[PDB]
Every structure is written in structure tokens, then in C-alpha cells.
Ligand binder design. Structure first.
Ligand SMILES: [Ca+2]
Length: 223
């Protein structure tokens, strides 16, 4: 997250860190045994880390649970990042409390102008690199589809939306991928891609979760 603020320990209780010996992507807890992330975060041997603030210090609220199964969306296209969404099933159910909690799926798509919360442990610089150890937060609005397509000609599908600031300075970034975009207490987006980070006229692009609620619910119900 570039230009954000320190969330505070366990103030984003649905935020997960995906770990393969190191943090490499975010994700969102959507019930006690399932996590949603980005398909471009796929790898084998994922450990899901819940209840994290400082990802380099054991602080006492963590739950570490291995993935038993990963399901990349059937139509994921790694060249265009269309359908950039993946489901991860935990080997055992998480213990839910005030600091580890699930985020609700949306019943409707959010409109442009809605304010959302984006969070992650990604890079905090637009040039160069600095990775934080504690979770960072950013409040940002959903941009109109017209602004989004004008910023990224020929690249925005109906499964993507833009959020952020056309002036630049505030954005998600590398290492935030897979993490949540929450608006009005519902999961509306997944950190997916962008050109650089926090660059003028290049806002973040996010997977549009409301298009996938049917697939998510059907998949969870039979796996
Ligand atoms: Ca920790």
C-alpha cells in the first residue's frame, strides 16, 4: 500500500497472509474454512496465516493453517488477468473471534463513488521498495467504468473495476495482490493489477467479486 496508514493490530480481521516460507500475497476469509485470493497468486504449498499484524513477529492472535485444496477460476487468463480469482480451502476450520472473522459476500455490485477499504503488506513506495512488517490500510473510491477504461484502453473487462485516485500518490502495490477491497462491510474487490503503483492516471485494477458469487457459493457447497 502506497500512501496509506497503519491499520492497527487486528482491525481488519478478515485479512489473511498467504505464506510459502515468506509472505507473497493477501487474501480474504469468507467463512471458517475458505479463503478468496487472486488467481495470479497461485502456487503449491500455501500456508494461510490468520490474525496477523506484524508478519515477522509472533504476537499471540495468529492462526497458521495449511491449504488442502486450491481452485483457480475455470476461465482465468494469465495474459489479460481476466477472472483473476481463486479459492483456497483450509485443512481445518479457523477459530472465529473478534480478531479473526469472515467478511460477507455482496448481494449487489457496488457503484462508482462508493468508498472502500483496501489493505495489505505490499510495497509502500512508488519508486524503489520498502516492505512493511505491519498491515497498511487505504480508503479509496471506486472509479467510474469510463474513467477506468480511459486509463487502460483495451484492457478492462466486465470483471474488473478501478479504484483509487487519478492524481496518483495512493494505491495498492506489489505484495498486496489477492487482498480485500471492502465496501459497506462487503467484499467487493480483489487486488489484481496496475501499471506501476500510485502513478498519475494509472489507478489500481480489482477483480469484481459480485460477478463471482454464484461460482463461489456453488464451489464451496461441493468441495
Ligand atoms: Ca505475527
Amino acid at each position: 500500500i502506497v500512501g496509506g496508514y497503519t491499520c492497527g493490530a487486528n482491525t481488519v480481521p478478515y485479512q489473511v497472509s498467504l505464506n510459502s516460507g515468506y509472505h507473497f500475497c493477501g487474501g480474504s476469509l469468507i467463512n471458517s474454512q475458505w479463503v478468496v485470493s487472486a488467481a495470479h497468486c497461485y502456487k503449491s504449498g500455501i500456508q494461510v496465516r490468520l490474525g496477523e499484524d506484524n508478519i515477522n513477529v509472533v504476537e499471540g492472535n495468529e492462526q497458521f493453517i495449511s491449504a488442502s485444496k486450491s481452485i483457480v477460476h475455470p476461465s482465468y487468463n494469465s495474459n489479460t488477468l481476466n477472472n483473476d480469482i481463486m479459492l483456497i480451502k483450509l485443512k481445518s476450520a479457523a477459530s472465529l473471534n473478534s480478531r479473526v472473522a469472515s467478511i460477507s459476500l455482496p448481494t449487489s455490485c457496488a457503484s462508482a463513488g462508493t468508498q472502500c477499504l483496501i489493505s495489505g503488506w505490499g510495497n509502500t513506495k512508488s519508486s524503489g521498495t520498502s516492505y512493511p512488517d505491519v498491515l497498511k490500510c487505504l480508503k479509496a473510491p471506486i472509479l467510474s467504468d469510463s474513467s477506468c477504461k480511459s486509463a487502460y484502453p483495451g484492457q478492462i473487462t466486465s470483471n474488473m473495476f478501478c479504484a483509487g485516485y487519478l492524481e496518483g500518490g495512493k494505491d495498492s502495490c506489489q505484495g498486496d495482490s489477492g487482498g480485500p477491497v471492502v465496501c459497506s462491510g462487503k467484499l467487493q474487490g480483489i487486488v489484481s493489477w496496475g501499471s506501476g503503483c500510485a502513478q498519475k492516471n494509472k489507478p489500481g485494477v480489482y477483480t469484481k467479486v459480485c460477478n463471482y458469487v454464484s461460482w463461489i457459493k456453488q464451489t464451496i457447497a461441493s468441495n
